Structure 1
């Protein structure tokens, strides 16, 4: 039993909800919140901009130190940093950005990072401003993640489309 509330069960381990991941993180304080990161951990917009703003820019400060020490992430890669006031940990995961020409086949590699964590609150990777089809992203998530994932979908219209079209 966990503290997540109001989710639709899609499969044994994948759940989905129409919600703002920031407010969901602030309420649940999950062990792991996933950020829709880029390789430079520059959290300007989309999910990343929203998570960072909610931390009063502490996420960005921590991230800049991480990059100064380690260099950029790989597309498809991840790193574990603090969750600040939102979660115990933030798993920054780099889905491919279609608006940069990155290979959508890397989306599966991105979701594989979730399997290192027993339970996660997450957005759909590569959706939104990363330019991929959210229906496809959900399919890859379901077919790749084996741990317990709670997906927050900000757009109410999009959520209903994902559910109604889910196979």
Structure 2
């Protein structure tokens, strides 16, 4: 039994809610919140900008030190950093940004990072401003992640679309 509540059960291991991932994190304080990152960990807008804003820019400060030491992530890759005031840990996962020309086949690789954590609060990778088909991303999530994932879908109309079309 965990602290996630009000989520629709989609599958044996995937739950979904129409909610802002930032607000869910402050309420639940999960062990792991997933950030929809870019390879440079530049958290300017979208999910990343919103999480970072909620950390008072501490996420960005930590991320800049990480990049200075380690260089950029790979598309499809991840790193574990602090969750600051939102979670114990933040798993920064880079899904392909279709609006940047990044290959959509890497979405499965991106979701595989979730399997290293028993329970996660996570956004729909590559959806929204990342430019990929959100129905497809959900199919990849359900077909790739085996650990317990709680998905927070921000856009109300998107959420309604995803539930009503889920196979």
Same fold at TM > 0.5: yes
Deviations 1:80-121 (A, max 9, x none): 000000000000000000011111000000000000000000
- Classify the secondary structure of the residue corresponding to 1:146: coil
User: What is the Cα-based RMSD across aligned positions, in Å?
Assistant: 0.3
Q: Which residue of 1 aligns with 2:112?
A: 112
Distance 1:92 1:120 in 2: 12
Count residues with an aligned counterpart. Answer: 167
Q: Which residue of 2 aligns with 1:40?
A: 40
**Stretches of structure 2 lacking an aligned partner (at least 5 in a row):** none
Distance 1:156 1:129 in 2: 15
Distance 1:144 1:76 in 2: 13
The Cα of 1:156 is off from its aligned counterpart by: 0.9
Distance 2:111 2:133 in 1: 15
Distance 1:78 1:34 in 2: 10
Q: Which residue of 2 aligns with 1:86?
A: 86
Distance 1:15 1:27 in 2: 17
Distance 2:48 2:134 in 1: 17
Deviations 1:14-73 (A, max 9, x none): 000000000000000000000000000000000000000000000000000000000000
Q: What is the TM-score when the length of structure 1 is the normalising length?
A: 1.00
Runs of 4+ residues deviating >3 angstroms = none
Distance 1:56 1:158 in 2: 28
Distance 1:101 1:21 in 2: 26
**Stretches of structure 1 lacking an aligned partner (at least 5 in a row):** none
The Cα of 1:124 is off from its aligned counterpart by: 0.3
Q: What is the TM-score when the length of structure 2 is the normalising length?
A: 1.00
The Cα of 1:129 is off from its aligned counterpart by: 1.0
- Classify the secondary structure of the residue corresponding to 1:44: coil
Distance 2:126 2:3 in 1: 26
